[PDB]
Structure 1
Amino acid sequence: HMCDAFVGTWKLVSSENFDDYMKEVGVGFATRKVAGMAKPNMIISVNGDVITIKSESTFKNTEISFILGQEFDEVTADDRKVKSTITLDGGVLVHVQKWDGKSTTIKRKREDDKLVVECVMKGVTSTRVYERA
């Protein structure tokens, strides 16, 4: 019943500072431009201990399935090959991606009727707000 409040289909409604976040991650110009235009959905489901997060957009369709606390391989939408671990901390899903001696953290939290996604790469934070589809 862990992540019940996350389950569902969500649509992007606002973004702030995402180009700067992508620059800090190392995303190149053309991918920043096209991927920054995208308006993904996020489809979150749970089956037993396995959480699945799918993100569909005109740019790319991605999907991850995982167990909390258990590292996995992920290919990001910008084609990074990262080692990811996702945990639940005080009701927030905390997703750490490691690659090339670098690290970024993505937090997903329910706030009112929204699902708020905060992405942090060193000093740079981007906030993306999703609402139910």
Structure 2
Amino acid sequence: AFTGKFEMESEKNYDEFMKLLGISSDVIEKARNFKIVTEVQQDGQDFTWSQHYSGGHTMTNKFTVGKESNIQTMGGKTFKATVQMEGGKLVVNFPNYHQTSEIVGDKLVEVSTIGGVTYERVSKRLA
């Protein structure tokens, strides 16, 4: 399940991926500098996913898998999208953009992708 604290820390194609997502360089750079922290409370199909970034600014997110849900995209951008569950993976899709998240070896890891580049993430599990 996706539950407990997590420590986002090693990433790939981060700057290109965020630039394609459409993000300002100052926050791309400072976000990388700030090791991101994350926490999740899976709840029988419902979820309350949370983030802490660019100076640990907290943000809350939430959805039910299979259903469309509103997904804020930082204080500024926003979109609606469907979060999904293909067994262990927490699959998800967006207009012209896709990702899948997954727990492996009791670690939160993900395989995000956009435009024409991957974006693996790694986030150790902790409490």
* TM-score scaled by length of structure 1: 0.82
CA distances 1:64-84 after superposition (whole Å, capped 9, x unpaired): 111111112222137321112
Q: Which residue of 2 aligns with 1:91?
A: 88
Q: AA paired with 1:20?
A: E
Q: Distance in 1 between matches of 2:16 and 2:33?
A: 14
Contact 1:86 1:96 in 2 (8 A): yes
Matched residue SS, 1:88 = coil
Q: Distance in 2 between matches of 1:112 and 1:46?
A: 18
Contact 1:41 1:56 in 2 (8 A): yes
Change (3 A) 1:61 1:97: farther
Aligned length: 125
Q: 42-51 vs 83-92, which deviates more?
A: 42-51
CA distances 1:64-123 after superposition (whole Å, capped 9, x unpaired): 11111111222213732111210001321012233xxxx322211111132112211121
Runs of 5+ in structure 1 lacking a partner? Answer: none
Q: Distance in 2 between matches of 1:104 and 1:62?
A: 21
Matched residue SS, 1:23 = helix
Contact 1:117 1:128 in 2 (8 A): yes
Q: Which residue of 2 aligns with 1:127?
A: 120
Q: Distance in 2 between matches of 1:23 and 1:85?
A: 23
Matches within 5 A, 1:1-133: 4=1, 6-57=2-53, 58-77=55-74, 79-98=76-95, 103-133=96-126
* TM-score scaled by length of structure 2: 0.86
Displacement of 1:131 after TM fit?
0.9
Matched residue SS, 2:29 = helix
Displacement of 1:21 after TM fit?
0.3
